[model samples]
Target: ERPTFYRQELNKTIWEVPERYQNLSPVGSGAYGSVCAAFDTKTGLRVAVKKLSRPFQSIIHAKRTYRELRLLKHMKHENVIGLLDVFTPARSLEEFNDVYLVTHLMGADLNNIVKCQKLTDDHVQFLIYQILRGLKYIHSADIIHRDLKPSNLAVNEDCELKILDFGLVATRWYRAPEIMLNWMHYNQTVDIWSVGCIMAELLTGRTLFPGTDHIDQLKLILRLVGTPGAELLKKISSESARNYIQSLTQMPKMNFANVFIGANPLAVDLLEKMLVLDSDKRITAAQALAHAYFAQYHDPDDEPVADPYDQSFESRDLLIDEWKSLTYDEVISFVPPPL
Candidate 1:
């Protein structure tokens, strides 16, 4: 449940605003949720309210519901969204209707901002730095950010960036090559591929791999990075995918200057290290943090944690009653931050 864009969900009163909140006006809508700007009168806070349309509609929804709740509580970092509160309009377990997530309201998502604003090199550094710092924490915990597109990321003019949605809500283009290849199992480096794509977009003001679908995306990328080494190609689980890779015509490597015009050479060096066709060879967030591209931004004492206290959901099936119980267990377990 999050705002995907700036357009308001125009209605006099689309959904009933809770008693403790006022001035509710929806700003965006997404896959199956709606986000709105509101004020929490009880806590004197400005917040974003995301309404999950059919949280218990099916097993997938329940699993995702559990996943989002679990990760939101587990990850506590400067670059991740803070789960301020959660509430349901249901009077009791029997009447439970929908799930609502309360988080600190942000100025806008990166997609809309990128479309309208011209970014500076410093903005790129700061934003990407925050993303890597967040990734460092996420990867250390062994959590792979399945989605890393501009839309899934929130940002402010001050260069603050916070990653959202690692519960498998991935936008297609930001997808990594391993996922594109349908590999049986992948690791944190999938996120590094996305980091490269994001940095390229931020620098050039366009998507590097603008594929309309999975195959097209693969085609767009394979030629750009050329073929993966034979050793890594052996790791592909899908024989059809492996066959497809072998079938494609030989591709030449691209020049960084042509792809990201006017980019810093150090930045270009970092890009080459990322954006690999092989997950095994792709750059890691920890390594990127120490690169010369970020030399001026480095802190001698900074030692980002590799992992954070973490958790998730594994149940494949659960009845509505069971889902409610799971939600309750997660709710009471979350300890709020001290003011």
Candidate 2:
């Protein structure tokens, strides 16, 4: 006989897990924490467990933990990673210091898959379709992925894709131009830009805008998309950032046909719309689904939106203990998914 839940220390960190979960194996580590694959003996299923590295180290960090947990619990879509369980070892507020989340185990991330596989046009199309499908649900909730890249996209042998990591922003290569220009209030368009970068990478098996630095990032983007018009430039609130663009030698837009010479025209067209410098004109997740690229897979009834997220907590800064208490409550209330 064993305890219902027990604590195991691995890599100098303690993970308190239920007895039903066994044979824990290391998966990988991210900036936030470490992950492991465990067999859920009670259900005879494999699951991924994520332990927060330092969730309560700062107000911002704790807020991210709360936000990620809340969003994971809220999200219910095939293309989005679903939350299966969450727990903590601490019995009371005074001892609560760690949080563990469990989710469906995935084979590999897009980052590794792209490095090894030569994706056909159909593979590329299907992958992008699922991404847009997931984004439709996320943006419907008025939540931007902020971070959309190969690393955050989990995939399996069946070409199934699930978007992961909702807590941070995008990598510089996949980041939107608005963020680079310091746009104070960007929206879902930022995500569209990242999608465009990812689509390009999928088609070519190389990073689209692999700039050396921030300045080079903008330059690389401008080199392909061309400089923004006076009206667009004026919209940038930062005088220095606006002026910096004005000072740079204007460049002509590269023809997509020339760039993606061997790619499908429909795919190229969607890329053009998604990577627009003026985010206002970028194609939305809904609009992208209707593009001819996804005609074979598009189903209006299948693509559902979600209610807006409760954003009250986002605007308030709660204390560490308060966040801990709230998260602990959430963990305790977590219900296992139906078998």
lDDT string for model 1 (42-117, tens) is: 6888888877767778767777777777777777787888688776655556776567777878877788777788
TM-scores, each model vs. reference: 0.88, 0.95
**Model 2 agreement with the true structure over 1-339: per-residue lDDT tens digits:** 223788787776678888878888888776798988999887777889888889999887888888878888888889999788887777777888888888888878888887898889999999999999999999998888888989889998889999995522238999997887777899988988999999999899889999787888989999999999876876887888877988999987899989988999999999999988888899999999999999989999999898667978888877977886787777777776788
**Pairs clashing within candidate 2:** none
Task: Quote the positional error of residue 238 for candidate 1 in Å.
Answer: 3.3
Candidate 2, after superposition: displacement of residue 268 in Å?
Answer: 0.8
Off by over 4 Å in 1: 1-18, 166-170, 300-312
Q: Give candidate 2 misplaced runs (Cα > 4 Å).
A: 1-3, 167-170
